[PDB]
Amino acid sequence: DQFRVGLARLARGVRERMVMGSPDTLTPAKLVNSRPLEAALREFFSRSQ
Amino acid sequence: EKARDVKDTSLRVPPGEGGIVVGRLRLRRGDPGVELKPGVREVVRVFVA
Amino acid sequence: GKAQFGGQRFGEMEVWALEAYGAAHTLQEMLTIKSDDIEGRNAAYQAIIKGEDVPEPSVPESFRVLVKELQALALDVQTLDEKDNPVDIFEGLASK
Amino acid sequence: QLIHKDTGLIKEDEVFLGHLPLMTEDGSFIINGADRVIVSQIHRSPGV
Amino acid sequence: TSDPVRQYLHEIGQVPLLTLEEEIDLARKVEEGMEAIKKLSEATGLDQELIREVVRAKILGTARIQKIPGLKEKPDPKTVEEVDGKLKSLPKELKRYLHIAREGEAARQHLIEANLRLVVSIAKKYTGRGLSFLDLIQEGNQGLIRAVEKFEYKRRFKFSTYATWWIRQAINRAIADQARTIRIPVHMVETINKLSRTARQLQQELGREPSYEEIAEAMGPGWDAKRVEETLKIAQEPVSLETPIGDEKDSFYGDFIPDENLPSPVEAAAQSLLSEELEKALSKLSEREAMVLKLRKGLIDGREHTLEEVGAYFGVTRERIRQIENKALRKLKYHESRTRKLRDFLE
Amino acid sequence: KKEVRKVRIALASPEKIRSWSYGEVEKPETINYRTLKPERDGLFDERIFGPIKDYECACGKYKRQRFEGKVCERCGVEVTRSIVRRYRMGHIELATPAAHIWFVKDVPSKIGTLLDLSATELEQVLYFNKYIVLDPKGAVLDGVPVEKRQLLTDEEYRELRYGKQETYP
Amino acid sequence: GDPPKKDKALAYLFGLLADPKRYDLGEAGRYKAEEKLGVGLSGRTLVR
Amino acid sequence: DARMGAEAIQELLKELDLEKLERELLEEMKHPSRARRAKARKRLEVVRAFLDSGNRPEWMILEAVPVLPPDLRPMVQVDGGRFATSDLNDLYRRLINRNNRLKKLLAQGAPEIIIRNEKRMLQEAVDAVIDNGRRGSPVTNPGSERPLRSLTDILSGKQGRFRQNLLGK
Amino acid sequence: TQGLPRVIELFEARRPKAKAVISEIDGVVRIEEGEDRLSVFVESEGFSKEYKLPKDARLLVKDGDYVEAGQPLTRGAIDPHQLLEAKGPEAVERYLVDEIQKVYRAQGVKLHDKHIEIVVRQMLKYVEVTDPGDSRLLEGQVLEKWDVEALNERLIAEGKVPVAWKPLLMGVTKSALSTKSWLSAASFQNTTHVLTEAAIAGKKDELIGLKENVIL
DNA sequence: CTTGACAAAAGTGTTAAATTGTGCTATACTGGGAGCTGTCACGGATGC
DNA sequence: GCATCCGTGAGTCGAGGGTAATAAGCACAATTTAACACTTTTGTCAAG
RNA sequence: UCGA
Ligand SMILES: [Zn+2]
């Protein structure tokens, strides 16, 4: 339940990442980020009731 | 008596509790396997039983 | 709490109880001398250390804080005496 | 995998996401060094 | 429920966009107005911005512009009206450049308003900063104004470019000047950005977060563990005292913070006792030396007195005062070891 | 020095707030990230609210209780007990005068009850949505002459003041 | 909160139902509501 | 003159004659209509409040905004090298920010639209400092749900300065 | 048993769910219904009126019974304000006290009436102004019993026409929030609301109550 | 208590090295966005 | 007048455990601050 | 989230 919303925040982390830089060659390595997921998981286990 | 620059911040066992020591955990920054929070040199954790 | 090594809180209903007994200086002390009063707890401590009777407090502190807080809302709150004349509770501090 | 629709540029490179806390044998996670636990929840099931 | 954002959205929605024609016409009318001001500066022998603002005073409202700049900026009847009267003395060729000027001035406003629909769309990808929607968009429009005044249509470039470059800046500056509660100057923000950037990169690669060794290694020359750790320490922002606690919604943060900047009730009687017992133990010294001691340590005027000064009013030489306070000091040292009253206060 | 038996609460005029204020805080800063000292015009500024250390002036030219209350010539702080930073208030002068939200959103809205405007319309006005008439000066809309306290809209205002036009393609 | 465009009701109201992301009806919900309504359902959405 | 915003309300309020409205509402109360007498009463009550208090209604639209002393809204570092601060500081900060930017683009002669919008933002910021969440979605620190506690937020409430730091201690 | 919620329903002077109609004047009771709706007329010599009642609700009165003001026609609880405007303040106090003590004694808790009585007096301590006469008061204005009492007292000596008024009963909340001291209501609740009107009127606390002194 | 000779502490002026503030980038970019439910009683302003 | 919407509450002290996260960047003027060369006092010593 |  948290994994999906975090992965959605990352899903839009991909969007604005696609519309800039160099549309020709960008490996998925540059298209993927830690934060919108890892923070979403870190927010859960620590602060969830 | 000159009061030197450095003074005593030492952690003393809080009142209402005390006893022997079964263990001591020493973690100083720059040591292997341990990453200490930025701007902080040492952390010491005593087990009082 | 025990952690901060502080004293107990006097509840609103404890206050009510003290009012019910009609103990004036007990409740007065609870609200001033031993709680938030600036020179209250100090002069008291000195009085006990010197073997005297603790004098009567003046300013609650947090009441004054309440006053200035109100002033932040542009509420003009003045303490009159018996004649409707202003009395400084801030003891010549912010007078300007 | 990164797949270009029109360009037909197919570039597949495995990436990294992050760290996901695992569970012990007794079913207790360890967060910040002090092991914690997740209680079950209850709400009326979906549907009509 | 009266959304502040829909207000602005529909407010900019009232004024339509501008095609090539309208845009070029606008810019040309503007530059024409400004150069008109340039000639009008030679007319009455005045400055550019002077007459330029005097025009505004007659256009974007009359009394209101000079009424609330704040308590003092420029006088309305004095340094303004006389500029109106002084430029009224001029013939056709001159007096017409005035109308040209004000016309260009209006054209500037129309230009800014027409392209506002861009600036709004610029600050939407810029959300999540230390500032909200309108707060960001406005500080972007501030960049739109400068994007206007510096724009040249003669280069045949669509204004949507030159404007966007100034908005993209104005916002990224607006964050540097607001952001965290504590003020962080630009360069610091920059270096921080570079650091986090590197972090994001080598963490994407290595499959885990770096160390101050490797992250400063990838940062180039002069970058060591201690520095990246330092700037990382400065990076964090203060924590609100209204921070909740655990399961309890009632428990706050700041109620856990003690006041050590005010004397504790014990410390009052402490300093009192010291200042008293010291005065008692002081009376066993010669009328001179006892005074000299408290004159030296500042128990009198609250300030240290050099041997020269202590000897100046006593007529004695500095050396004398020195020997005096030494001797007196040890003569105190005799009684103190006996009474053991002041042997306390050892911290 | 006097018994206080009475406490009055009233409205504070802008002049009164000016009187309370030791200065206008302009710079929206707290403290420099290095010095950790109150910024020039910052919300913590010593030059107005008073010194952090008792009797110790900001710059450090005046220190002890000897000279007291006299403002220094460098930083401009006053030499006095550090307690003043508790009781000393500032002010912020607004370019466009704003309203205290209490009287606006109070259940029996005081402005709305006085000026006789519903909270619904007063909301539109105070928050910059719809205009309100001040001395129409012979102005008339839709055959019915417009009067003070009446609300207008975006188009209607510039239509009365700047005129009604029609643009055709 | 915005002018009633025809594509604006197409890209908005579609999400509240047909979008499997912003609308996800639990497997238990889909299944139970499927058997309790005496009918059947394809995805986890309200409409296709 | 259609002028809109809190400034206008300040104008009308400043022009008010309380005595005239007093007598007019007195004669308005004498009306036999069961409705009219009531509303006339309730309005005359506020009018009389202002008359008896001796306070001017135009003060409700505020120019100079009072600022709470540093020790009342403290910022201090705890053990471990952290920093802690009050939300009121951030509120004030955003307020004065919007205010200064306002003055800047105002005296600059920027287009009326942006100016007006900025005025609105100033109003809602002032409100955020006075009573936060009283209108619209409450202002929260970026990333966090928790609303910023303002003056009114501190005064009123279960944990408010009265029920917490006054009526018990 | 109605229990604590009843006690609160009383102390707050709230409208009963079971609320029973009472005769506004002293008439004779005349029961009239064709079978649609139950109607009960109560008619004095020159006056008259009827009460619309559901057929289901059981009444306490018989056709041809001479009754008085405030006397209940139907079974169940009675709206405090209704009998305040029907019989008078005395009967009100009596009813309130007797009902609170009813619940308490029913639960097996013994207490002296004085306690309840003080609160009860605190409830109706406010009055509504009607035809202020020679006084600065306005129609519909609300003020304490003692205040208007003294106003009339002095008005008589001045020869001026006194102030006619009506007793006004209210719950402990609406009572306490209406108190002379602004610090009291500010401490209580509705703070944001209280301080507004307080500051507007510029009201000035004499520190008469003990709680507003507890603040001080 | 004094007189002269001196090390160290503390001063004062100019400068090297950082830190901080400001400006501009011209292909063309022209209206955001996230939603969240299983209260409850009451009192007043507002709308039919 | 009669349905609806907004606003305000709702128990008392404790016990703990506490803190996450930034994708613009570069060139240069403006100060500020650390560096440093040398001056004037200040403190200390020896002998009177 | 437990103690009374
Ligand atoms: Zn100074």
| CA distance linking residue E5 with residue E2, whole number of Å | 9
Q: Are the C-beta atoms of residues H58 and H38 closer than 8 Å to each other?
A: no
For residue I187, the 8-state DSSP code is H
Domains of chain E, start order? 1-180 (1.20.120.1810), 184-237 (1.10.10.10), 263-343 (1.10.10.10)
Which are the residues after which chain H is interrupted (C to N > 2.5 Å)? Answer: none
Q: Does E203 touch chain D (CB under 8 A)?
A: yes
- Residue B26 is given by DSSP the state E
* Region of residue F128 (left: phi > 0; alpha: psi -120 to 50; beta: else): left
Taking CB atoms and an 8 Å limit, are F43 and H117 in contact across chains?
no
Q: Is F49 annotated in some ligand binding site? A: no
Distance CA D4, CA D11 (A): 8
Q: How crowded is residue E235: how many other Cβ atoms within 10 Å of its Cβ?
A: 17
Test E70 with H103 for CB contact under 8 angstroms: yes
Show contacts of A25-32: CB within 8 Å, 24+ apart: A25/D9, A25/D11, A26/D2, A27/D2, A27/D11, A27/D13, A28/D1, A28/D2, A28/D11, A28/D12, A28/D13, A28/D15, A29/D13, A29/D15, A29/E204, A29/E205, A30/E204, A31/D2, A31/D15, A32/D15, A32/D16, A32/D17, A32/E204
F82 within 8 A of F51, measured Cβ to Cβ: yes
Task: Give me the phi and psi of I41, to 5 degrees please.
Answer: -85, 140
Determine if residue F75 is labeled as part of a ligand binding site: yes
* Number of folded domains that form chain C: 1
Nearest residue in chain F measured CA to CA from H125:
F98
E221: tokens are 């020359």
Nearest-angstrom CA–CA distance, I194 and H134: 16
Q: Are strands H84-85 and E239-240 parallel, antiparallel or unpaired?
A: parallel
Distance CA F150, CA F133 (A): 6
CA distances from D3 to A10, D7, F152 (A): 18, 9, 56
Q: Is the CB of E248 under 7 A from strand L?
A: yes
Å separating the CA of residue E309 from the C1' of nucleotide J7: 21
Q: How was this structure determined?
A: X-ray
Is F20 within any annotated ligand binding site?
no
Instruction: Residue C53: give the domain boundaries.
Output: 1-96
Q: Where does residue F55 fall: left (phi above 0), alpha (psi -120 to 50 degrees), or beta otherwise? A: left
Helix H segments across chain E? Answer: 4-12, 20-44, 48-57, 63-67, 81-86, 92-114, 116-122, 133-149, 159-176, 186-206, 212-217, 225-235, 265-282, 287-296, 307-312, 318-339
Nearest Cα to Cα of residue F102 among I192, E344, E268: I192
Distance from CA of E271 to the nearest CA of A (A): 46
The SS3 assignment for E107 reads helix
Q: H120 near F124, Cβ under 8 Å?
A: no
- DSSP of E134-203, one letter per residue? HHHHHHHHHHHHHHHHT--GGG---HHHHHHHHHHHHHHHHHHTSSSSSB--HHHHHHHHHHHHHHHHHH
Q: What are phi and psi of F31, to 5 degrees?
A: -145, 155
Give the pair of three-digit tokens for residue H32: 């036999």
Q: Look up residue D3 and give its two tokens.
A: 């797949």
Task: Write the CA distances from E240 to B21, E252, H83, H139, integer angstroms.
Answer: 37, 10, 9, 14
CA of H9 to C1' of J46 (A): 23
CA distance I99 to I9: 10
Q: Is the CB of A18 under 7 A from strand K?
A: no
CA dihedral G26, G29, G35, G41 (to 10 degrees): -50
CA distances from E287 to E277, E291, E294, I202 (A): 18, 6, 12, 62
Q: Please state whether strand K lies within 7 Å of residue E322 at its CB atom.
A: yes
**H81 vs chain B: nearest CA distance in angstroms?**
8
DSSP H151: H
Give E196 CA → K7 C1' in Å: 46
In the structure, do chain G and chain F come into contact, i.e. share 3 or more CB pairs under 8 Å? Answer: no
Angle at I181 between CA I180 and CA I183, to 5 degrees: 155
Which chain L positions come under 7 Å from a protein C-beta?
1
Do the Cβ atoms of E102 and E55 come closer than 8 Å? yes
Q: Are strands D10-11 and F151-152 parallel, antiparallel or unpaired?
A: unpaired
* Contacts with D16 from chain E: Cβ below 8 Å: 203-208
B window 12-41, beta carbon within 8 A of H: 39-40
Report DSSP state, residue G43.
S
- List the one residue out of H23, E321, E9 whose CA is nearest residue G3: E9
> Is I206 within 8 Å of F5 when comparing Cβ atoms?
yes
Compute how many other C-beta atoms are within 10 angstroms of the C-beta atom of residue H69: 26
Which of F73, F100, F90, F111 minimizes the C-alpha distance to F25?
A: F90
CB contact under 8 A, I205 and F6: yes
3-state secondary structure of I16: coil
Cβ(H169)–Cβ(C10) under 8 Å?
yes
The neighbours of chain F, by the rule of 3 or more Cβ pairs under 8 Å, are: C, E, H, I
Give dist(CA F95, CA H13) in Å, integer. Answer: 18
**Which residues line ion ligand 1, judged by CB < 5 Å?**
F 57, 59, 61, 72, 74-75
**Cβ–Cβ gap F12/C94 under 8 Å:** no
Measured distance CA(C33)–CA(C23) in Å, rounded: 15
Q: Is I178 helix (H, G, I), strand (E, B) or coil?
A: coil
Instruction: State how far the Cα of F37 lies from the Cα of F40, in Å rounded to an integer.
Output: 9
Q: CA Rg, chain A, in Å?
A: 13
Q: What is the DSSP letter of H59?
A: G
3-state secondary structure chain F: CCCCCEEEEEECCHHHHHHHCCCECCCCCCEECCCCCECCCCCCCHHHHCCCCCCCCCCCCCCCCCCCCCECCCCCCECCCCCHHHHCCEEEEEEEEEECHHHHHCCCCHHHHHCCCCHHHHHHHHCCCCEECCCCCCCEECCEECCCCCEECHHHHHHHHCCCCCCCC
Q: What is the DSSP string of E118-135?
A: HHHHHTTTT-SSSS-HHH
Q: Is E197 on the interface with A (CB under 8 A)?
A: no
List beta partners, residue A27.
none
Does the beta-carbon distance from D17 to A32 stay under 8 Å?
Answer: yes
